[PDB]
DNA sequence: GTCGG
DNA sequence: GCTGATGCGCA
DNA sequence: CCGACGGCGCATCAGC
């Protein structure tokens, strides 16, 4: 793609700030810059040309100058060489290990996949399962496999109760040719902003997905959000499909549209849409959009009959799901 | 690290 | 047991 | 100049 070198550089810097420095705002600064540069329709010739874009300030522009002159970045070269930095970065690639826990493990001499396997007693459940499937989770899911996963989930959900609606969101709903994992929005008429008329609505779906051996492990689970692991069935004599991350989110049926906006993403898109709402005096979460009062606090939910209605409030032209990718 | 006020 | 804080995950 | 910077579910731990 057009400015891949620059955006790769900014992503790598973002990850270093998040994982090693634990400087979450620098992380967000680099992500924002990376995003805006990724959509820019020309090959960037200078750092001062980048500087024009919002979110690209002095420091990133200098770095871009150095990247375009020398084809690399010295700041980043020395981070790749730092033993403690690279190790902390690696460990964070395990699901369940964040920046804090990664720094802890490196300080105790635990720096590699082998060190982790040799020390499974030190790992909570989530981290155990993230290590187990370390390799499978690094792989992307071809859309063709997502279509098989969709068919299994919708049909098994339809068998628990025909009133559930499942919708597959994330990168899939944005039309990507492959996904990092599977994101499933769930609704049932008995769960609304007014009442939970029926208990265990998510449980029964998880349970049924376990019964037929689609869901294989659980990372975390509660009344409205399931995070775990699934796998497609394979044919006689065939190599098994990799295990895949699956997230299931139960959202009140009267708040579907805010839910599907949230869960369709992208994450950076969600951050910018929500930021823009605040400039306009609103707050958007996955349940509602509420006007911000004259003091600061949020009023009562405004009426929403569609995704578009949320865009209209904040005076943004509608973006189709496929146009909300980085 | 960036930016609006 | 509770609550509040924090880590880590999701888009 | 600076303080603001999306929003929240579940797991875990500290303090009661
Ligand atoms: Mg993701
Ligand atoms: Mg996803
Ligand atoms: Na700029
Ligand atoms: Na991680
Ligand atoms: Na996901």
GROMACS .gro file of C-alpha atoms (C1' of nucleotides) and ligand atoms in nm:
model
  363
    1UNK     CA    1   0.000   0.000   0.000
    2UNK     CA    2   0.088   0.364  -0.061
    3UNK     CA    3   0.276   0.485   0.251
    4UNK     CA    4   0.338   0.142   0.412
    5UNK     CA    5   0.690   0.218   0.538
    6UNK     CA    6   0.578   0.528   0.727
    7UNK     CA    7   0.265   0.369   0.879
    8UNK     CA    8   0.463   0.057   0.976
    9UNK     CA    9   0.715   0.282   1.147
   10UNK     CA   10   0.442   0.466   1.335
   11UNK     CA   11   0.268   0.143   1.439
   12UNK     CA   12   0.596   0.002   1.571
   13UNK     CA   13   0.653   0.321   1.769
   14UNK     CA   14   0.297   0.306   1.898
   15UNK     CA   15   0.348  -0.048   2.019
   16UNK     CA   16   0.674   0.043   2.193
   17UNK     CA   17   0.506   0.331   2.380
   18UNK     CA   18   0.215   0.112   2.487
   19UNK     CA   19   0.406  -0.201   2.586
   20UNK     CA   20   0.742  -0.076   2.712
   21UNK     CA   21   0.700   0.289   2.817
   22UNK     CA   22   0.341   0.234   2.933
   23UNK     CA   23   0.272   0.579   2.781
   24UNK     CA   24  -0.081   0.529   2.652
   25UNK     CA   25  -0.123   0.879   2.507
   26UNK     CA   26   0.188   0.857   2.293
   27UNK     CA   27   0.048   0.523   2.178
   28UNK     CA   28  -0.274   0.696   2.080
   29UNK     CA   29  -0.087   0.983   1.913
   30UNK     CA   30   0.106   0.740   1.688
   31UNK     CA   31  -0.209   0.537   1.609
   32UNK     CA   32  -0.396   0.852   1.508
   33UNK     CA   33  -0.106   0.967   1.292
   34UNK     CA   34  -0.070   0.623   1.138
   35UNK     CA   35  -0.441   0.617   1.055
   36UNK     CA   36  -0.453   0.959   0.890
   37UNK     CA   37  -0.139   0.885   0.685
   38UNK     CA   38  -0.279   0.548   0.576
   39UNK     CA   39  -0.582   0.719   0.410
   40UNK     CA   40  -0.379   1.001   0.250
   41UNK     CA   41  -0.406   0.951  -0.130
   42UNK     CA   42  -0.046   1.053  -0.232
   43UNK     CA   43   0.304   0.920  -0.171
   44UNK     CA   44   0.440   1.144   0.104
   45UNK     CA   45   0.755   1.326  -0.018
   46UNK     CA   46   0.848   1.521   0.297
   47UNK     CA   47   0.779   1.540   0.668
   48UNK     CA   48   0.642   1.895   0.621
   49UNK     CA   49   0.383   1.755   0.372
   50UNK     CA   50   0.280   1.507   0.645
   51UNK     CA   51   0.274   1.789   0.899
   52UNK     CA   52  -0.030   1.929   0.714
   53UNK     CA   53  -0.236   1.624   0.816
   54UNK     CA   54  -0.411   1.646   1.156
   55UNK     CA   55  -0.237   1.445   1.427
   56UNK     CA   56   0.107   1.474   1.261
   57UNK     CA   57   0.312   1.728   1.465
   58UNK     CA   58   0.683   1.826   1.474
   59UNK     CA   59   0.825   1.507   1.623
   60UNK     CA   60   0.656   1.266   1.378
   61UNK     CA   61   0.749   1.490   1.082
   62UNK     CA   62   1.116   1.483   1.176
   63UNK     CA   63   1.093   1.104   1.207
   64UNK     CA   64   0.935   1.087   0.865
   65UNK     CA   65   1.218   1.306   0.729
   66UNK     CA   66   1.469   1.060   0.876
   67UNK     CA   67   1.269   0.765   0.742
   68UNK     CA   68   1.252   0.903   0.389
   69UNK     CA   69   1.621   1.008   0.388
   70UNK     CA   70   1.776   0.693   0.542
   71UNK     CA   71   1.501   0.430   0.481
   72UNK     CA   72   1.481   0.349   0.853
   73UNK     CA   73   1.472   0.498   1.202
   74UNK     CA   74   1.757   0.505   1.454
   75UNK     CA   75   1.528   0.539   1.752
   76UNK     CA   76   1.369   0.208   1.641
   77UNK     CA   77   1.696   0.033   1.552
   78UNK     CA   78   1.810   0.073   1.915
   79UNK     CA   79   1.477  -0.056   2.045
   80UNK     CA   80   1.508  -0.371   1.831
   81UNK     CA   81   1.855  -0.418   1.984
   82UNK     CA   82   1.750  -0.360   2.346
   83UNK     CA   83   1.708  -0.706   2.503
   84UNK     CA   84   1.457  -0.597   2.768
   85UNK     CA   85   1.250  -0.392   2.524
   86UNK     CA   86   1.217  -0.665   2.258
   87UNK     CA   87   1.129  -0.923   2.525
   88UNK     CA   88   0.862  -0.710   2.684
   89UNK     CA   89   0.721  -0.653   2.335
   90UNK     CA   90   0.717  -1.021   2.251
   91UNK     CA   91   0.544  -1.131   2.573
   92UNK     CA   92   0.262  -0.884   2.518
   93UNK     CA   93   0.169  -1.078   2.202
   94UNK     CA   94   0.031  -1.346   2.432
   95UNK     CA   95  -0.335  -1.289   2.503
   96UNK     CA   96  -0.367  -1.204   2.873
   97UNK     CA   97  -0.014  -1.069   2.903
   98UNK     CA   98  -0.024  -0.686   2.888
   99UNK     CA   99   0.259  -0.428   2.946
  100UNK     CA  100   0.249  -0.464   3.326
  101UNK     CA  101   0.252  -0.842   3.338
  102UNK     CA  102   0.512  -0.853   3.063
  103UNK     CA  103   0.750  -0.630   3.259
  104UNK     CA  104   0.695  -0.846   3.569
  105UNK     CA  105   0.787  -1.169   3.383
  106UNK     CA  106   1.099  -1.019   3.223
  107UNK     CA  107   1.220  -0.899   3.563
  108UNK     CA  108   1.180  -1.258   3.691
  109UNK     CA  109   1.400  -1.383   3.397
  110UNK     CA  110   1.104  -1.511   3.189
  111UNK     CA  111   1.172  -1.380   2.836
  112UNK     CA  112   1.074  -1.647   2.579
  113UNK     CA  113   0.806  -1.891   2.473
  114UNK     CA  114   1.012  -2.170   2.627
  115UNK     CA  115   1.048  -1.975   2.955
  116UNK     CA  116   0.670  -1.934   2.953
  117UNK     CA  117   0.605  -2.306   2.890
  118UNK     CA  118   0.860  -2.394   3.158
  119UNK     CA  119   0.662  -2.161   3.396
  120UNK     CA  120   0.293  -2.231   3.332
  121UNK     CA  121   0.228  -2.232   3.709
  122UNK     CA  122   0.281  -1.852   3.707
  123UNK     CA  123   0.000  -1.789   3.455
  124UNK     CA  124  -0.363  -1.716   3.513
  125UNK     CA  125  -0.622  -1.900   3.305
  126UNK     CA  126  -0.641  -1.641   3.025
  127UNK     CA  127  -0.263  -1.638   2.988
  128UNK     CA  128  -0.249  -2.018   2.993
  129UNK     CA  129  -0.490  -2.037   2.698
  130UNK     CA  130  -0.314  -1.749   2.513
  131UNK     CA  131   0.015  -1.938   2.538
  132UNK     CA  132  -0.144  -2.267   2.438
  133UNK     CA  133  -0.275  -2.117   2.114
  134UNK     CA  134   0.001  -1.861   2.065
  135UNK     CA  135   0.065  -1.968   1.709
  136UNK     CA  136  -0.293  -2.018   1.594
  137UNK     CA  137  -0.394  -1.671   1.721
  138UNK     CA  138  -0.117  -1.506   1.513
  139UNK     CA  139  -0.291  -1.628   1.199
  140UNK     CA  140  -0.569  -1.446   1.020
  141UNK     CA  141  -0.893  -1.612   0.921
  142UNK     CA  142  -0.972  -1.616   0.551
  143UNK     CA  143  -1.315  -1.471   0.478
  144UNK     CA  144  -1.418  -1.811   0.333
  145UNK     CA  145  -1.367  -1.966   0.679
  146UNK     CA  146  -1.547  -1.671   0.843
  147UNK     CA  147  -1.849  -1.758   0.622
  148UNK     CA  148  -1.844  -2.118   0.756
  149UNK     CA  149  -1.809  -1.989   1.113
  150UNK     CA  150  -2.102  -1.750   1.058
  151UNK     CA  151  -2.320  -2.036   0.927
  152UNK     CA  152  -2.238  -2.256   1.229
  153UNK     CA  153  -2.302  -1.980   1.484
  154UNK     CA  154  -2.627  -1.843   1.330
  155UNK     CA  155  -2.772  -2.194   1.290
  156UNK     CA  156  -2.681  -2.319   1.636
  157UNK     CA  157  -2.818  -1.998   1.787
  158UNK     CA  158  -3.141  -2.043   1.587
  159UNK     CA  159  -3.171  -2.391   1.750
  160UNK     CA  160  -3.153  -2.261   2.111
  161UNK     CA  161  -3.433  -2.014   2.041
  162UNK     CA  162  -3.557  -1.874   1.706
  163UNK     CA  163  -3.588  -1.518   1.851
  164UNK     CA  164  -3.213  -1.462   1.896
  165UNK     CA  165  -3.054  -1.256   1.624
  166UNK     CA  166  -2.680  -1.302   1.578
  167UNK     CA  167  -2.485  -1.064   1.363
  168UNK     CA  168  -2.113  -1.108   1.286
  169UNK     CA  169  -1.938  -0.771   1.318
  170UNK     CA  170  -1.575  -0.646   1.337
  171UNK     CA  171  -1.362  -0.663   1.022
  172UNK     CA  172  -1.599  -0.921   0.873
  173UNK     CA  173  -1.894  -0.678   0.859
  174UNK     CA  174  -1.657  -0.421   0.707
  175UNK     CA  175  -1.597  -0.664   0.418
  176UNK     CA  176  -1.237  -0.760   0.492
  177UNK     CA  177  -1.093  -1.057   0.298
  178UNK     CA  178  -0.959  -1.190   0.629
  179UNK     CA  179  -1.016  -1.134   1.002
  180UNK     CA  180  -0.808  -1.142   1.316
  181UNK     CA  181  -1.092  -1.319   1.495
  182UNK     CA  182  -1.471  -1.359   1.507
  183UNK     CA  183  -1.697  -1.093   1.661
  184UNK     CA  184  -2.063  -1.184   1.729
  185UNK     CA  185  -2.336  -0.938   1.836
  186UNK     CA  186  -2.633  -1.106   1.998
  187UNK     CA  187  -2.983  -0.985   2.071
  188UNK     CA  188  -3.291  -1.148   2.226
  189UNK     CA  189  -3.639  -0.983   2.281
  190UNK     CA  190  -3.630  -1.069   2.653
  191UNK     CA  191  -3.327  -0.845   2.715
  192UNK     CA  192  -3.381  -0.473   2.676
  193UNK     CA  193  -3.283  -0.148   2.848
  194UNK     CA  194  -3.606  -0.191   3.049
  195UNK     CA  195  -3.568  -0.543   3.183
  196UNK     CA  196  -3.390  -0.875   3.170
  197UNK     CA  197  -3.710  -1.081   3.132
  198UNK     CA  198  -3.503  -1.398   3.087
  199UNK     CA  199  -3.188  -1.513   3.268
  200UNK     CA  200  -2.880  -1.692   3.123
  201UNK     CA  201  -2.945  -1.575   2.767
  202UNK     CA  202  -2.573  -1.566   2.677
  203UNK     CA  203  -2.494  -1.880   2.877
  204UNK     CA  204  -2.740  -2.092   2.681
  205UNK     CA  205  -2.576  -1.986   2.354
  206UNK     CA  206  -2.225  -2.046   2.483
  207UNK     CA  207  -2.336  -2.382   2.626
  208UNK     CA  208  -2.485  -2.493   2.291
  209UNK     CA  209  -2.175  -2.378   2.104
  210UNK     CA  210  -1.972  -2.595   2.348
  211UNK     CA  211  -2.207  -2.893   2.308
  212UNK     CA  212  -2.134  -2.911   1.934
  213UNK     CA  213  -1.758  -2.856   1.991
  214UNK     CA  214  -1.736  -2.517   1.818
  215UNK     CA  215  -1.639  -2.324   2.133
  216UNK     CA  216  -1.332  -2.509   2.271
  217UNK     CA  217  -1.211  -2.274   2.553
  218UNK     CA  218  -1.318  -1.978   2.765
  219UNK     CA  219  -1.093  -1.680   2.845
  220UNK     CA  220  -1.359  -1.485   3.029
  221UNK     CA  221  -1.735  -1.496   3.061
  222UNK     CA  222  -2.013  -1.296   3.228
  223UNK     CA  223  -2.380  -1.207   3.173
  224UNK     CA  224  -2.325  -0.989   2.860
  225UNK     CA  225  -1.977  -1.069   2.714
  226UNK     CA  226  -1.805  -1.397   2.621
  227UNK     CA  227  -1.441  -1.409   2.522
  228UNK     CA  228  -1.290  -1.741   2.418
  229UNK     CA  229  -1.180  -1.986   2.154
  230UNK     CA  230  -1.342  -2.176   1.870
  231UNK     CA  231  -1.257  -2.410   1.580
  232UNK     CA  232  -1.415  -2.525   1.254
  233UNK     CA  233  -1.463  -2.901   1.206
  234UNK     CA  234  -1.228  -3.064   0.955
  235UNK     CA  235  -1.284  -3.352   0.711
  236UNK     CA  236  -1.168  -3.715   0.735
  237UNK     CA  237  -0.788  -3.730   0.703
  238UNK     CA  238  -0.755  -3.351   0.687
  239UNK     CA  239  -0.528  -3.127   0.892
  240UNK     CA  240  -0.725  -2.947   1.167
  241UNK     CA  241  -0.816  -2.581   1.120
  242UNK     CA  242  -0.634  -2.348   1.359
  243UNK     CA  243  -0.811  -2.249   1.681
  244UNK     CA  244  -0.963  -1.901   1.660
  245UNK     CA  245  -1.049  -1.623   1.899
  246UNK     CA  246  -1.424  -1.558   1.933
  247UNK     CA  247  -1.596  -1.268   2.117
  248UNK     CA  248  -1.972  -1.273   2.179
  249UNK     CA  249  -2.146  -0.963   2.308
  250UNK     CA  250  -2.512  -0.959   2.425
  251UNK     CA  251  -2.666  -0.612   2.378
  252UNK     CA  252  -3.021  -0.504   2.471
  253UNK     CA  253  -3.242  -0.539   2.164
  254UNK     CA  254  -3.372  -0.179   2.180
  255UNK     CA  255  -3.007  -0.061   2.157
  256UNK     CA  256  -2.898  -0.278   1.858
  257UNK     CA  257  -2.787   0.019   1.642
  258UNK     CA  258  -2.541   0.165   1.895
  259UNK     CA  259  -2.418  -0.189   1.961
  260UNK     CA  260  -2.357  -0.270   1.594
  261UNK     CA  261  -2.185   0.064   1.538
  262UNK     CA  262  -1.954  -0.014   1.833
  263UNK     CA  263  -1.884  -0.375   1.742
  264UNK     CA  264  -1.834  -0.307   1.368
  265UNK     CA  265  -1.543  -0.067   1.439
  266UNK     CA  266  -1.270  -0.015   1.350
  267UNK     CA  267  -1.129   0.064   1.692
  268UNK     CA  268  -0.954   0.382   1.577
  269UNK     CA  269  -1.270   0.474   1.381
  270UNK     CA  270  -1.472   0.429   1.702
  271UNK     CA  271  -1.225   0.645   1.892
  272UNK     CA  272  -1.250   0.928   1.635
  273UNK     CA  273  -1.627   0.911   1.595
  274UNK     CA  274  -1.666   0.931   1.972
  275UNK     CA  275  -1.411   1.214   2.002
  276UNK     CA  276  -1.598   1.405   1.730
  277UNK     CA  277  -1.927   1.351   1.917
  278UNK     CA  278  -1.775   1.521   2.226
  279UNK     CA  279  -1.671   1.828   2.021
  280UNK     CA  280  -2.037   1.836   1.917
  281UNK     CA  281  -2.166   1.796   2.277
  282UNK     CA  282  -2.260   1.425   2.280
  283UNK     CA  283  -2.125   1.102   2.419
  284UNK     CA  284  -2.150   0.774   2.233
  285UNK     CA  285  -2.106   0.433   2.387
  286UNK     CA  286  -2.232   0.092   2.265
  287UNK     CA  287  -2.575   0.142   2.426
  288UNK     CA  288  -2.664   0.504   2.360
  289UNK     CA  289  -2.585   0.850   2.237
  290UNK     CA  290  -2.664   1.110   2.500
  291UNK     CA  291  -2.642   1.490   2.483
  292UNK     CA  292  -2.382   1.651   2.710
  293UNK     CA  293  -2.542   1.903   2.944
  294UNK     CA  294  -2.436   2.262   3.011
  295UNK     CA  295  -2.221   2.142   3.308
  296UNK     CA  296  -2.054   1.835   3.161
  297UNK     CA  297  -2.267   1.525   3.247
  298UNK     CA  298  -2.474   1.323   2.999
  299UNK     CA  299  -2.849   1.363   2.959
  300UNK     CA  300  -3.097   1.097   2.853
  301UNK     CA  301  -3.067   0.866   2.549
  302UNK     CA  302  -3.172   1.022   2.217
  303UNK     CA  303  -3.391   0.813   1.984
  304UNK     CA  304  -3.212   0.592   1.729
  305UNK     CA  305  -3.378   0.389   1.452
  306UNK     CA  306  -3.061   0.327   1.250
  307UNK     CA  307  -2.683   0.355   1.231
  308UNK     CA  308  -2.732   0.664   1.011
  309UNK     CA  309  -2.926   0.840   1.289
  310UNK     CA  310  -2.614   0.840   1.508
  311UNK     CA  311  -2.415   0.993   1.223
  312UNK     CA  312  -2.683   1.262   1.169
  313UNK     CA  313  -2.673   1.376   1.534
  314UNK     CA  314  -2.302   1.451   1.525
  315UNK     CA  315  -2.331   1.598   1.175
  316UNK     CA  316  -2.113   1.340   1.001
  317UNK     CA  317  -2.206   1.209   0.658
  318UNK     CA  318  -2.277   0.837   0.672
  319UNK     CA  319  -1.985   0.599   0.628
  320UNK     CA  320  -2.067   0.249   0.510
  321UNK     CA  321  -1.910  -0.029   0.724
  322UNK     CA  322  -1.643  -0.098   0.457
  323UNK     CA  323  -1.535   0.266   0.475
  324UNK     CA  324  -1.466   0.245   0.852
  325UNK     CA  325  -1.142   0.039   0.822
  326UNK     CA  326  -0.793   0.176   0.879
  327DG     C1'  327   0.299   1.324   2.083
  328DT     C1'  328  -0.053   1.663   1.926
  329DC     C1'  329  -0.369   2.032   1.929
  330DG     C1'  330  -0.741   2.387   2.009
  331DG     C1'  331  -0.848   2.773   2.253
  332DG     C1'  332  -1.928  -1.091   5.102
  333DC     C1'  333  -1.887  -0.564   4.935
  334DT     C1'  334  -1.673  -0.168   4.667
  335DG     C1'  335  -1.325   0.074   4.415
  336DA     C1'  336  -0.889   0.038   4.152
  337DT     C1'  337  -0.636  -0.159   3.819
  338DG     C1'  338  -0.487  -0.493   3.430
  339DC     C1'  339  -0.634  -0.658   3.004
  340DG     C1'  340  -0.940  -0.733   2.663
  341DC     C1'  341  -1.295  -0.562   2.273
  342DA     C1'  342  -1.454  -0.236   1.871
  343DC     C1'  343   0.152   2.799   2.658
  344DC     C1'  344  -0.062   2.346   2.852
  345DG     C1'  345  -0.452   1.936   3.021
  346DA     C1'  346  -0.731   1.685   2.730
  347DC     C1'  347  -0.726   1.289   2.503
  348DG     C1'  348  -1.378   0.685   2.378
  349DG     C1'  349  -1.588   0.397   2.642
  350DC     C1'  350  -1.669  -0.027   2.896
  351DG     C1'  351  -1.698  -0.586   3.038
  352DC     C1'  352  -1.466  -0.935   3.313
  353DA     C1'  353  -1.087  -1.086   3.628
  354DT     C1'  354  -0.825  -0.992   4.009
  355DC     C1'  355  -0.664  -0.782   4.430
  356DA     C1'  356  -0.670  -0.463   4.833
  357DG     C1'  357  -0.910  -0.286   5.209
  358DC     C1'  358  -1.296  -0.324   5.483
  359LIG    MG1  359  -0.881  -0.614   1.700
  360LIG    MG1  360  -1.222  -0.878   1.527
  361LIG    NA1  361  -0.050   1.857   1.172
  362LIG    NA1  362  -0.142  -0.933   2.516
  363LIG    NA1  363  -1.266  -0.965   1.867
   0.00000   0.00000   0.00000
